[PDB]
């Protein structure tokens, strides 16, 4: 079955360069004309790159012209794509897409490229407690703040994912440099503290790991 | 090259109703226009491609239409999993897209939950000290949060974030950071914050002091 699937984005300084991948599977891979189309983070679509489906023809828009590369390894069932001179306005999620036909039918999930001078940073993680009972009847919320990692992203859980339903965990907002997220749960009152109720935090680009638990007096 | 303005950025729309999206091209396009459907963690789903012929396995709640250089877009029966951003596409020369459509759904209004929390030991420790206020599951998604220090207003130093529509119940969640310097957070005694929102005519206050425990 029709599979694309990206890889290789990351996270790349001002002026500096990348090469992403997309791998096919489940057709004839060297006889499709094939693109990459990027998200931008305000959620615009972008046609970035087109290549026909023996590698002889190829189109870029005036944007990324003489910055971007698409390529093609036909035997290896793979697209590339070869950036160089990367500006901020570059940062987006990249799609593989396979075009058969004049628009889009199908596509890859994606793979993220984040153009910055800021440096790699793990997160700080701190308890989000009520304390003095100052407010707790029936259900009561405990939260976990992340800060100060660079770059996105964090993966937030609660009690190593037993606790699921009563989660919000909020898009992070960068400051200057760097991240800030934060994250609630709601527990019923008589299972806390009670039971425990801990927020786990994986950073991949530093490769942490951090549990906090929430201890019941933050005041 | 060849522009697509796509007319509604944003919308909000009950179950059971109709929406519609306008997607107007710089020049004749010849009925070469597609729509997607963009979710999420997904790739864009095709929904119509020629103007108007549905992909196969697209609900027929779904329809466009349009000619020469104007375009519609239309769901009919408005169902939950409809949320979504959604792209109309030209491809009679080169490729370009709308800037697109978020469409979110109607609720009966709801009001936050309010929530503060005092700054952690171990941020303290650090030299740092947020205060965190949670607004959650409340609807419309337009909402206001006011930190006070000691009773005046303060704006710098803090971050708001806000989610989108909850898949589960059609609310909203937001919240809301102030972070000080820890010398700066003991010059001071009460830290409030203030949801103002249509379900009530007075605001949730609520508040800490460093004042026990």
């Known amino acids: 079955e029709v599979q694309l699937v990206e890889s290789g984005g990351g996270l790349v300084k001002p002026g500096g360069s990348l090469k992403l991948s997309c791998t096919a599977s489940g057709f004839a891979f060297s006889d499709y004309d094939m693109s990459w189309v990027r998200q931008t983070p305000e959620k615009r679509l972008e046609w970035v790159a087109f290549i026909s489906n023996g590698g002889y023809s190829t189109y870029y828009p005036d944007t990324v012209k003489g910055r971007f590369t698409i390529s093609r390894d036909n035997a290896e069932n793979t697209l590339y794509l070869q950036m160089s001179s990367l500006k901020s306005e570059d940062t987006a999620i990249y799609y593989c897409?396979?075009?058969?036909?004049?628009?889009?039918?199908?596509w890859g999930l994606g793979t993220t490229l984040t153009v910055s001078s800021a440096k790699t940073t793990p997160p700080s993680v701190y308890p989000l407690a009520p304390g003095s009972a100052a407010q707790t009847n029936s259900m009561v919320t405990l939260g976990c703040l992340v800060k100060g990692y660079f770059p996105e992203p964090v993966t937030v859980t609660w009690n190593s994912g037993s606790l699921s339903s009563g989660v919000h965990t909020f898009p992070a907002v960068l400051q200057s440099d760097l991240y800030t997220l934060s994250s609630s749960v709601t527990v019923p009152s008589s299972t806390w503290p009670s039971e425990t109720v801990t927020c786990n935090v994986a950073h991949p680009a530093s490769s942490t790991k951090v549990d906090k638990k929430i201890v019941p007096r933050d005041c | 090259d060849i522009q697509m303005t796509q007319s509604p950025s944003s919308l909000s729309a009950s179950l059971g109703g109709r929406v519609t999206i306008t997607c107007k091209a710089s020049?004749?396009?010849?009925?070469?226009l597609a729509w997607y459907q963009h979710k999420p963690g997904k790739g864009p789903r095709l929904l119509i491609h020629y103007t108007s012929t549905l992909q196969p396995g697209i609900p027929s709640r779904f329809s466009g239409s349009g000619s020469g250089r104007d375009y519609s877009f239309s769901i009919s029966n408005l169902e939950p999993e409809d949320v979504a951003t959604y792209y109309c596409?030209?491809?009679?020369?080169?490729?370009?897209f709308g800037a697109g459509t978020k469409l979110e759904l109607k609720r009966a209004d709801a009001a936050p939950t309010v929530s503060i929390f005092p700054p952690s030991s171990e941020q303290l420790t650090s030299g740092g000290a947020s205060v965190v206020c949670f607004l959650n599951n409340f609807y419309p998604k337009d909402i206001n949060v006011k930190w006070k220090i000691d009773g005046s207003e303060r704006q710098n130093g803090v971050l708001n974030s806000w989610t989108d529509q909850d898949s589960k119940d059609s609310t909203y969640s937001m919240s809301s950071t102030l972070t000080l310097t820890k010398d700066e957070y003991e010059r001071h005694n009460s830290y409030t914050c203030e949801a103002t929102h249509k379900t009530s005519t007075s605001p949730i206050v609520k508040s800490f002091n460093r004042n026990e425990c």
């Open positions: 020049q004749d396009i010849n009925k070469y």
């Open positions: 897409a396979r075009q058969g036909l004049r628009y889009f039918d199908y």
């Open positions: 596409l030209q491809y009679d020369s080169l490729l370009s």
